[PDB]
């Protein structure tokens, strides 16, 4: 659901998983991107 180069890059998503939702679309504001269905763009291939 979320392809990233590293897990550390998903550190920004810690604000999404938490009761805050400041950015809301952390998936995008976390380096990662929004995939359709387990279909990475290949940029990260993770």
UniProtKB/Swiss-Prot annotation:
Matching entries from Gene3D superfamilies are given as: Thionin-like
Q: What superkingdom heads the lineage?
A: Eukaryota
- Locations listed in the record: Secreted
Query: Which Gene Ontology terms of cellular component type are present?
Result: extracellular region
In this UniProt entry, which cysteines form S-S bonds? Answer: 3-40, 4-32, 16-26
Keyword Secreted (UniProt): yes
Family matches, as InterPro entries: Thionin (IPR001010), Thionin-like_sf (IPR036391)
Biological process terms from the Gene Ontology for this record are: defense response
Keywords attached to this Swiss-Prot or TrEMBL record, sorted alphabetically, are:
Disulfide bond, Plant defense, Secreted
User: What Pfam family is a match, any one?
Assistant: Thionin
Similarity-based family: Belongs to the plant thionin (TC 1.C.44) family.
The entry's other comment says:
Two isoforms exists, a major form PL (shown here) and a minor form SI.
Chain's role: The function of this hydrophobic plant seed protein is not known.
- State the protein's name: Crambin
Organism of origin: Crambe hispanica subsp. abyssinica
